[PDB]
Amino acid sequence: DGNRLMLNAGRGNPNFLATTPRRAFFRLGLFAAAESELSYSYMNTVGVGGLAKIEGIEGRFERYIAENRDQEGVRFLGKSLSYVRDQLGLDPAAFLHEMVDGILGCNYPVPPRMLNISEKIVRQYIIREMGADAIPSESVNLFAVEGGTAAMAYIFESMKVNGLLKAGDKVAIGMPVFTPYIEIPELAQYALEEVAINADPALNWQYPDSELDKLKDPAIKIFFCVNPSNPPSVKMDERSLERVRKIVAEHRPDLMILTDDVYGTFADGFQSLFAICPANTLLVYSFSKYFGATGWRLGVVAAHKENIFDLALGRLPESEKTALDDRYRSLLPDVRSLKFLDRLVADSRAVALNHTAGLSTPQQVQMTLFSLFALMDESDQYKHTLKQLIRRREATLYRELGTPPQRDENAVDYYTLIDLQDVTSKLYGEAFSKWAVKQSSTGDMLFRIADETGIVLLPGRGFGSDRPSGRASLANLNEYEYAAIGRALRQMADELYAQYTQ
Amino acid sequence: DGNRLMLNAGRGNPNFLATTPRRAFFRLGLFAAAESELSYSYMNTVGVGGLAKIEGIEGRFERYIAENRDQEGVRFLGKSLSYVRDQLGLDPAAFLHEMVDGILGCNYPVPPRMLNISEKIVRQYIIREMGADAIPSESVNLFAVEGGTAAMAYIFESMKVNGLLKAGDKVAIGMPVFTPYIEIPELAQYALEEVAINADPALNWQYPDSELDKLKDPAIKIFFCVNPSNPPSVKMDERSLERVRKIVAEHRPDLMILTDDVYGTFADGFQSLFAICPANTLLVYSFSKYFGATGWRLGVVAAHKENIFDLALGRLPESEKTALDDRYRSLLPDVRSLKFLDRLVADSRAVALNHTAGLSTPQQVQMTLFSLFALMDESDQYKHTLKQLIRRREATLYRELGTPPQRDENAVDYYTLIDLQDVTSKLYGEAFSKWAVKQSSTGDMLFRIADETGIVLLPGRGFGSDRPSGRASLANLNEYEYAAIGRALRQMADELYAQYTQ
Ligand SMILES: *Cc1c(COP(=O)(O)O)cnc(C)c1O
Ligand SMILES: *Cc1c(COP(=O)(O)O)cnc(C)c1O
Ligand SMILES: [Cl-]
Ligand SMILES: [Cl-]
Numbered sequence A, B: 001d002g003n004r005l006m007l008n009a010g011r012g013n014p015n016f017l018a019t020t021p022r023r024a025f026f027r028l029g030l031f032a033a034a035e036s037e038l039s040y041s042y043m044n045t046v047g048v049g050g051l052a053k054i055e056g057i058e059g060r061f062e063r064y065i066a067e068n069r070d071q072e073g074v075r076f077l078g079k080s081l082s083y084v085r086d087q088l089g090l091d092p093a094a095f096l097h098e099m100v101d102g103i104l105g106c107n108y109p110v111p112p113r114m115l116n117i118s119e120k121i122v123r124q125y126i127i128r129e130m131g132a133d134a135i136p137s138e139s140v141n142l143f144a145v146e147g148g149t150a151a152m153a154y155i156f157e158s159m160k161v162n163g164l165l166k167a168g169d170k171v172a173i174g175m176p177v178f179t180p181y182i183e184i185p186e187l188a189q190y191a192l193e194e195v196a197i198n199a200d201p202a203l204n205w206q207y208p209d210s211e212l213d214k215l216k217d218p219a220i221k222i223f224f225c226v227n228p229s230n231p232p233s234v235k236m237d238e239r240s241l242e243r244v245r246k247i248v249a250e251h252r253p254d255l256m257i258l259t260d261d262v263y264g265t266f267a268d269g270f271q272s273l274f275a276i277c278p279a280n281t282l283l284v285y286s287f288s289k290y291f292g293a294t295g296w297r298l299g300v301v302a303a304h305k306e307n308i309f310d311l312a313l314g315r316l317p318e319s320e321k322t323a324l325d326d327r328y329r330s331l332l333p334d335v336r337s338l339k340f341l342d343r344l345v346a347d348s349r350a351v352a353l354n355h356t357a358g359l360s361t362p363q364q365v366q367m368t369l370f371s372l373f374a375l376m377d378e379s380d381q382y383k384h385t386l387k388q389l390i391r392r393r394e395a396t397l398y399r400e401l402g403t404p405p406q407r408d409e410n411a412v413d414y415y416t417l418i419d420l421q422d423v424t425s426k427l428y429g430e431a432f433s434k435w436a437v438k439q440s441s442t443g444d445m446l447f448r449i450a451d452e453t454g455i456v457l458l459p460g461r462g463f464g465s466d467r468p469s470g471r472a473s474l475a476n477l478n479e480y481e482y483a484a485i486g487r488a489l490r491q492m493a494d495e496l497y498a499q500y501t502q
Helices: A002-009 A020-037 A057-067 A072-087 A092-104 A116-129 A147-161 A180-186 A209-216 A238-250 A308-314 A318-327 A340-348 A361-376 A381-397 A420-439 A442-453 A479-497 B002-009 B020-037 B057-067 B072-087 B092-104 B116-129 B147-161 B180-186 B209-216 B238-250 B308-314 B318-327 B340-348 B361-376 B381-397 B420-439 B442-453 B479-497
Strands: A140-145 A170-175 A193-198 A220-226 A256-260 A281-286 A299-304 A415-419 A469-473 B140-145 B170-175 B193-198 B220-226 B256-260 B281-286 B299-304 B415-419 B469-473
Touching (some): A057 A092, A092 A116, A140 A361, A147 A180, A180 A193, A209 A238, A256 A308, A308 A340, A361 A381, A420 A479, A442 A479, B020 B361, B057 B092, B072 B092, B092 B116, B140 B340, B147 B340, B170 B180, B361 B381, B381 B415, B415 B420, B420 B479
Parallel strands (some): A170 A220, A256 A281, B170 B193, B170 B220
Antiparallel strands (some): A281 A299, A415 A469, B140 B299, B415 B469
16 A cells, blocks of 8 residues: 555655644543533433533633643643643633534534634644744635645636636646646646646756746746655755746736645745745645644645735636626625635535535644644654654665765755666766666666565656656655665665676 | 331332432532532631532532542432533523532521522423423422422411311312321311212222312312322323313312322323413422432422412402401511412411521422432433332232233322222132122231231222222332232132132
């Protein structure tokens, strides 16, 4: 399943996971279960509870924390309350009841877009990790969704439905990008045309100015990028972000930006395009990778309250405004005041079902607890732990290839590129590396590792020339498995060197 | 004492008792004791507490419930709060403080008639078990008293004092009734005249229309009945209740009804005369039999807020109104607005002591807890348990007499009639049963059982012919004792059959 996921979906699945916010969730659940039972009125039954009451919830919660000081999840829950009440200044009783009611999953999400306090908490996390601090928190709204996967499906459908993207429109795509994102515009369902914004291996996988300038073409309605990138696993540098900023400000104030920033926390000092061009950007952030929460399906779509999506909607042709008046008629009297972010919500479940739309309340609670976990960790201990783990696995991989590729300030390294030439160069000089590349390819490299270790790697391209290389995730295997990849690739190189000399 | 009670008082005393509401009471007491100690200010003393404080009582109570989840009485107390707050919509803090203050018995009952929340709770129980659901709860008021025993004493005295019953007035009494109720009107203290409303054995102890029509006599001021009956142990059927209803509506809107419905819960789908004619009826309900609480002395008098007792009081001759103005002068400025139900309270302790009158607060608390116990038991598990117990004891009794009398929909069976003829008929045919009755009587039947088993039974009459029969309570003995009664009565029948044949 780990090997099959990389081939099919270009992921990625970590073998680590955040335990403390998970324990806090299950412990909160036991508290909420007791809260439900406090509202059950009848004798001689079993298995039926009532709704949790907001009245006196703080005092009951405080007792629960005091009696269970020995439980890690409970201590976390205790500090979470302080963080929300004391640092965020939010209503403590309202926070607790939203969490209790939320984890019970006994009420339809209200509002459907996101639960009130969860939105306020999660956006603090999002703003911080995206480097978007210069934007007032109150100007950022979130739509809680079933991972980045759901976000992308919802966004393209709403773009189509609301006439923001039309058949024949050009979508610029920062490349190399993983397979799934190439196909969605290529669907006849959308019939969009791709323009490649190509990263340069000579610039260490940054986008050249010349490539970024392609965005000046007014036929290009949207810039779509994974940042930090996947496969290449680098973050857009200061120059690149500035270039986009100037292009938007100077030439294309109408350019929509769709940015997928799931790997952000794995970079040093990450800054999102959302931070740089908030009015022009829809941010997709997934909790999957950082918290080891792929199965939880936790994501948000973020939008600035003043954005070009709502501006474009006000500039639509009359026939389209009339069609949308009909579409959203049941939702509100004035459809023209219905914002794009809330249209995403309505479009996600056929409009008529808007009031039972949204991410499940226990999922939002869990998302909120992951968010708190990271926010309360001021010295970034969890982040550093994961980074040290990733570096250890890297050292182990390149042990006999030695050693790892040199990493700059823009490095992410969730993924690593094992380049045959660079490896054979490090081992046996420049002359040998030129020859070794002409002998074997990516196929012979990936098939050998697979046969020796049972691990299949991603080809390392490209698009390029088929420079013989493979990509491994530093997130999904254990040390001896990275050591076995290195050993198999070292024997392959050693046998090439014995076929070099003689 | 069990045998002596049936002979003297026509009871009845169960050998079962409701344990859960009793455990809840004692557990509540320990909580209240701690509440009292929280208000004690001084050092180096022992055995002195203060008054329980309403402030923060919910939170303290909730902690008490959480720490003692393993205690049956405490779990019941926890669910009681939910029932009162959530299902009845009453003030939870006020409920708790009434219960805490109540069980401490540290304040005179206020108001004297009944404690406020206890009245609201207990009437829900009363209305449900009496089948009086069609009457709005707010239109039913209760006077908490020391069992049905105190109720009857109080009611007759107030009837006399307030001129509603006068010497020479006729009291109709549904018969057979147990001894105590025959004597109270016969007292020179009241000098009332009895009219027998006779139940018909041919109608399975229902009152014939012809007997019920006796109520048309305007000299009959009150209909007094035990329903379900005692001794006969049947409930008034649909026809009988309708007959009384029409008689009251058509001929006697002035007829007072006094109904004693202690056995109600032992019938299937019981409906009280209070439900049928609320404006005309004073309901006496005792908790003694159903909860096995004879020693607790727990009863209520129930009255509709719009009733013929207050109507009659407004129609009294001027000399009587003047006398009552003097009597109740200290109570309120306008004595003519003092309702009959509150007159019962004032008459119970000599008027001048009205403000220290009423049932003890711990008794009312216990009554409230019995009421909750039954209200919260939606599937009527306790009721069914008692009924199955009663049926088992019946099967055991008639095992060798076999088998029990056929029971119709109006059957109660707390008591059972052991008819010699019917028993000997079931065993040895109709011819033998006619002869066996002419040989032995009720005396020879009751004296034989007494000598063989040590149990004395009630004669089974009548008034009738002395058809040789005995009444046993199915509530007061254990299985082997019922088996010994059956065996003694079977040998008596077998020796009669050996004196038949030869
Ligand atoms: C793993 C990954 C995601 C996260 O997907 P979810 O559906 O949120 O689990 C998003 N984008 C890219 C490019 C990824 O590699
Ligand atoms: C047992 C019984 C009662 C109950 O008497 P308390 O004084 O309430 O215990 C009332 N009426 C009748 C006919 C009974 O047999
Ligand atoms: Cl835990
Ligand atoms: Cl107990």
